[PDB]
Amino acid sequence: DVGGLDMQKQEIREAVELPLVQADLYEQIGIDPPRGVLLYGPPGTGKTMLVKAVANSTKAAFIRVNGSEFVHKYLGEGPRMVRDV
Amino acid sequence: NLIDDVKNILNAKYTKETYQSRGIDAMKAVAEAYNNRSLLDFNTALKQYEKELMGDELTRSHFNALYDTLLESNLCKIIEPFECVEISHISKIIGLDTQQVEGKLSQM
Amino acid sequence: NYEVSEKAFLLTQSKVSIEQRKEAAEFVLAKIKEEEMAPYYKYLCEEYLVNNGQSDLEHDEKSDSLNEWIKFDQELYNELCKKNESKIKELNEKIQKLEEDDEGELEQAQAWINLGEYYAQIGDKDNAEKTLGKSLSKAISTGAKIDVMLTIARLGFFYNDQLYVKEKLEAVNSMIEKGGDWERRNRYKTYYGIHCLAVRNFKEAAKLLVDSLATFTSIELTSYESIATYASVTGLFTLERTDLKSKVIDSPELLSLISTTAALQSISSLTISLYASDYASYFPYLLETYANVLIPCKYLNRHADFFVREMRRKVYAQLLESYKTLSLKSMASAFGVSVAFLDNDLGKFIPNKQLNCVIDRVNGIVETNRPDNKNAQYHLLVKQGDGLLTKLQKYGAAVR
Amino acid sequence: DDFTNELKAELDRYKRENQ
Amino acid sequence: LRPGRIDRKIEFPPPSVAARAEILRIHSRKMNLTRGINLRKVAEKMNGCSG
């Protein structure tokens, strides 16, 4: 759907796909897996699309979480939305 | 041992282009014979196409390796309607001598 | 540490080839009286008295060596003592000053590490251990564990102990941190191979020993040659021929090894033999290997004819499955064995459930039946159920 | 035993020269 | 920096070839790396690299 992203593609692949598929081999080497990834730059440039493509391909669920709609204005809902998600 | 993708790469002309030589024809031929699990068809393509094809060492080594695996794969294919069958009969059908057959049939 | 232990073992376990015992006795002699190790020299001298090959001279005549000194001797107590004085005096002054000042928590450990050197070297077990174990209690770096781990090892080879060596090996390994760390793993891996070959389960040994991630030496925890030969040899004995062509002639480490030595007859000759499926080739080679590699070794001497019997069984077996109505007159004549040998050791194999060979010994004919059947599983299932059952009666003997 | 393997070796070697 | 607010000014190790090997050896002593490696080579390859 988007091309020319070779360098970011390769990056994402090793970050995201591989610990889910092949958990055993990180712990067998005895080095830390990656666990968190940050994507920085403007979204919706083809960025979001890679995320979405891996999610389908690995047959993982896509969960789209609005970080900014935690921005609730009290002690009520928001900090508990985080538990459940 | 993944015959369908050999066929897929053939079928489109963005993965084959305009490129036909004796060597490319050989791979198509070997693939068909692999799928059928027949050593005879493999031998006929191997011989005709030989000089251009196996004129590079890298291919020639894989054809060697493949000829063995195919040979055992034929042996298993023939027997597959089931045994109580004579080692003389198999030997004639496959194209080979008695001894080579006995030793490969044990390994299998 | 290892070359001393190794050549003392080699020395006593000698009865063939002059230069082996001679060269052994010289290195042991040179090192053991430089080193403060009296009690193994004693043991050596006890174990190698009234033997052939003597290099002891106190009453003997049975000597074939050209060195007439490996007897427990009084020169020992001048070389050992001036060294023991020096070392005790240095270390006494050193431990006192470091511990007074209270500088750091890591100088303290260096001060107790010096007594574990001292003490393994004189050959005390329990003093060496509890002096070092302080460092582990004052754990503040993983270093403390490395000294714990090294000391069990040294002592281990000298005594030739499986059991408290296994116990301490497990306890220090499992502990707080665990890690993929290189020489904790190299040491754990050889030592596990030692013990399980000793129990005679043999498969469990194979699972760690055959596999090696150490392409270079670990000096005193084993020689590169030594581990490597041992892994290939266990490889052959206790693993399948489907395994052999997978891993035990097709690991890239073995390839750099077979380059320069093939006298191991198990990284070459027996592996090739096994693949090719022969038994005209095999049995000659095995005897030559037994003498050249098993009997020099500290670990594979103790498993003698068991090692022999199961390998001859495995080769007969891979032949027995491949054929059916099989001409024992033809085999017994020309696959490199004698007739009389072939029958009686075939028959030795059969009742133990080591072959489903359908024999007639003298009518010359053998046939084959399937190696598993419902009956075979039922018989061994029953074996394990009464194994289980007995231990619970024991639980209910002392408790209750 | 150590002895047996040898006895057997020698028996085998004797057959082998006549094989 | 006047004594009685900050009394000691200690330099933190500037990175040298020998120092770099050492750190590497400690981190390698947790995980599965071949013995055929030479930390002296890897250390010498790196210049302008921190811990």
Burial classification of residue A20, based on how many CB atoms lie within 10 Å of its CB (0-12 exposed, 13-18 middle, 19 or more buried): exposed
CA distance B27 to B32: 9
Whether chains A and E touch (3+ CB pairs under 8 A) is answered by yes
B51–chain C nearest CA distance, Å: 32
Contact C192, C173 (CB under 8 A): no
Segments making up each domain of chain C, as ranges: 1-322, 323-369
CA distance B24 to B44: 15
Q: What is the DSSP letter of C54?
A: B
Q: Is C262 on the interface with D (CB under 8 A)?
A: no
Burial classification of residue C348, based on how many CB atoms lie within 10 Å of its CB (0-12 exposed, 13-18 middle, 19 or more buried): middle
Any chains having at least 3 CB pairs less than 8 A from chain B are C
B53–chain C nearest CA distance, Å: 29
Tokens for B49?
């196409």
Q: What is the DSSP letter of C123?
A: T
Interface test mutation site (partner B, options C275, C278, C322, max chain B beta carbons within 10 A): C322
Nearest CA to C263 out of C218, C306, C228 is that of: C228
Nearest CA to C41 out of C53, C31, C54 is that of: C31
E5–chain C nearest CA distance, Å: 26
Residues 6+ positions from C303 with CB-CB distance below 8 Å? C197, C200, C294
Length of chain C: 400
- H/E stretch holding A7 reads helix A6-12
D5–chain C nearest CA distance, Å: 8
CA distance C259 to C268: 10
Q: Do A29 and C180 touch (CB under 8 A)?
A: yes
CA distance C159 to C176: 28
Chain C partners of D2 at a C-beta cutoff of 8 Å?
A: 304
Q: Is E50 on the interface with C (CB under 8 A)?
A: no
CA distance C314 to C276: 14
Interface contacts C/D by beta carbons within 8 Å: 27
Residues 6+ positions from A69 with CB-CB distance below 8 Å? none
Chain C partners of B106 at a C-beta cutoff of 8 Å?
A: 277, 322-323
Residue at token pair 């050989």:
B26
CA distance A61 to E12: 48
Intra-chain end-to-end CA distance of chain D, in Å? 27
- H/E stretch holding C367 reads strand C365-368
- H/E stretch holding C327 reads strand C326-327
Q: Where are the alpha helices (DSSP H) in chain C?
A: 2-12, 18-32, 39-47, 76-101, 107-122, 126-137, 143-159, 163-174, 182-199, 203-209, 224-238, 241-247, 252-258, 269-276, 282-289, 304-320, 328-334, 339-349, 374-398
Residues 6+ positions from C151 with CB-CB distance below 8 Å? C116, C120, C128, C129, C132
How remote is the C-alpha of C127 from its chain's centroid?
Answer: 26
Q: Do D8 and C341 touch (CB under 8 A)?
A: yes
Interface contacts A/E by beta carbons within 8 Å: 8
Any chains having at least 3 CB pairs less than 8 A from chain D are C
Q: Do D12 and C337 touch (CB under 8 A)?
A: yes
Contact B32, B41 (CB under 8 A): yes
Nearest CA to C6 out of C219, C296, C349, C357 is that of: C296
Contact E33, A28 (CB under 8 A): no
Any chains having at least 3 CB pairs less than 8 A from chain C are A, B, D, E
CA distance D1 to A46: 75
Contact C251, C227 (CB under 8 A): no
3-state SS, one letter per residue, for C92-120 = HHHHHHHHHHCCCCCHHHHHHHHHHHHHH
Tokens for A62?
């896509």
Q: Which positions of A make up the binding site for ATP?
A: 41-48
Contact C152, E3 (CB under 8 A): no
